[PDB]
Symmetry: D2
Subunit: 212 residues, 4 copies
Amino acid sequence: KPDMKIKLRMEGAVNGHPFAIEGVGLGKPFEGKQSMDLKVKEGGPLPFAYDILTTVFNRVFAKYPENIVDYFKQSFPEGYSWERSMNYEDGGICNATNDITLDGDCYIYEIRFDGVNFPANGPVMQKRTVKWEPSTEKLYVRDGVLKGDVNEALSLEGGGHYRCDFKTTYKAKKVVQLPDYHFVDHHIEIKSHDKDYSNVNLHEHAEAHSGL
Amino acid sequence: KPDMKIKLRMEGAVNGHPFAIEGVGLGKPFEGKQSMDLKVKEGGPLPFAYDILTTVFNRVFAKYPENIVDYFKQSFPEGYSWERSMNYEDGGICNATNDITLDGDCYIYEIRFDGVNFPANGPVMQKRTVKWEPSTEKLYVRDGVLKGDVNEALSLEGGGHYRCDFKTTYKAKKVVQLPDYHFVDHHIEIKSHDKDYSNVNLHEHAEAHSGLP
Amino acid sequence: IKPDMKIKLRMEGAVNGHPFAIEGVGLGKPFEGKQSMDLKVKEGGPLPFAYDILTTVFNRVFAKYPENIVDYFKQSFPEGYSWERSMNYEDGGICNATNDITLDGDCYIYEIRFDGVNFPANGPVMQKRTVKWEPSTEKLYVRDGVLKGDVNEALSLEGGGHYRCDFKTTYKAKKVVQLPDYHFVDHHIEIKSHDKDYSNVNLHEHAEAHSGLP
Amino acid sequence: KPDMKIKLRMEGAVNGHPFAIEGVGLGKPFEGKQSMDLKVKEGGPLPFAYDILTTVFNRVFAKYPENIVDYFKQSFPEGYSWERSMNYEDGGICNATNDITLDGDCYIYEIRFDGVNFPANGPVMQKRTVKWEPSTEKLYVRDGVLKGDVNEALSLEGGGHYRCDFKTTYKAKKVVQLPDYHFVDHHIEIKSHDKDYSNVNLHEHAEAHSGLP
């Protein structure tokens, strides 16, 4: 529908220390906009940069034009799942999965997040990240499913950027029409939060296009 | 000027077998469009997919809006150089350099290209590539200079895509104002070629933008 | 630490989003660098992936260290140590694992988490086309006061050939210990026996530290 | 024969700076020892750490036991070639090739070396490297080809280590027997050099093994 709800629970760990986060949100799938509120349930206060979590906190919330087949909106009411590996340049690596289902007008996410090898004096473990830059995801078919790798970067507390390469596999629960090679522009932003990020308001604007 | 000239020479090797290519072209830097005709002088007929070369055959040919500092157009008349690593997903990797100078209204490229570890049954050696797909390049400043990364993909013959990780370092020959984080959309196309790619007409269209607001 | 030590572990994890859980008990000789264990699948069975991606997660205390190489791991006890590991396979599949090692009398206790993603449906892992890990030589070096370990490891495949994986591990002692110099550890891990569905597995590994070509 | 000599010329560039080096050397292939003296012919004084070149300056100089097929000694008198990518952890990447022939008792190398994207503040451009650590190479057959991977590391003058991933493809000029998965221990050492490394005396010891028995 034009206004949809979001409910999620993320269970995960970073450098072996476990945590859990829950969120409620709402979004406009055809306008490619969404927002949500999250609150650390376990493992707080988080000792790592919250920004590594945010892109894990749904490509149905993307404005697709009529000329590009919409893989994600097709998959419902059954839904879809995805897996993702996020490779940071300093060796830190996060693996994540999300199983997305639909209950009425509410998407339900079951999330697992696992990051390892983040250096003690790195920007993640020292909370020196500021914000994800906006980005352009490249989506393409392989083995009958959809993949979407990206060239991400976090702006840092004194300038400069901290790069991370995202690799994702999108799997529909049913048979859907596979799209052609296309792109999705992203802009994810934390609009507000408390001191230790126990509470976080997160927004994302995502839009598909066919390149130049 | 609104219309610029282009002359180039690439000397290189792929899997240890040397080759050399020269080209002539022209473009409109403020429109971000260019075209050129390339001829292989040595090492022909090339035993690898010509497409691995095309992105090596100049970001001055990109339409920059006023809201984004133009590092490349600033760097002239002195010019600039760039270094690039091209890591394909099956282990083949090409490293390339280009020293760009200006003589009147003509850009001069001196290009080196060396690719290795392309598997014999891979799409490059078997020449099963069709086209580069359009791409979006991410530019950011690091330690005083400018970088550019692209996650590119080659369209293949039987369907599917063959990905390549681009990583480029841009160095102006003079000090210029460094730009903020931004993007450049690309679309490179071989519009015409002869059978063994001894002659190639190559086009590229490029535009910088700041991404979604 | 004694010539004969005990092991039991529990691993909880998921591969391509399919969760599973495994428990094991074992024994070994830390000063001889040999060990063996029996593992049982408790949840997520029958496992739909190659069991071989799990085995290197199922302890560098079981490595024969010569006197001239500082033993980072044997020093860390009785308090113990932990490690994190990223295993980067050449076809894009990636596994992250952690192990928190404690000591109870003569028994090592492992708390293990394992998470692998992006394994293609037709790749050797999901199709269980792996045979065994080849022997390997680990390279260990200090960075930021802790110990690192990288190996170029390869799985032999079921009709000839090898399937590569990049191991990169951070070792973290829970107390202050003396840091070693750059050194090596030779490995050979082998599944000695198992039932048809890999619900039961008997796993062994031998390891020996050295300092390269003398 | 137990005593062989070496003569080589390497032509290359690092970050777009071309250079050339020639060397003469000697070794005992059946014991896995060799040494050579290298002289910089062009591009001196080299502005990068000489350590990036040495593993490019022949696995015929490795002691192979009887129970492991020797791909390299089988490859002569015709010889063999190899291609290699060396991926440093800070993004620096070098591509190298070597075409190895035999003239009487002298191995002749034709070497190309191309390194890109080394940061100006990194240990290579700053020249803060000490030596390569010993290493163990893993070799295996793929696609009728012999492959070689090493996780290398450079010791730095402050204790730390600067890792590099080695990927090499070995190709005999004739069809020869292929070995099973095995290992080669390495220890490469610069035993002497002048201040700006215009003269370098390089040694390497290597011995193949099957791993932990």
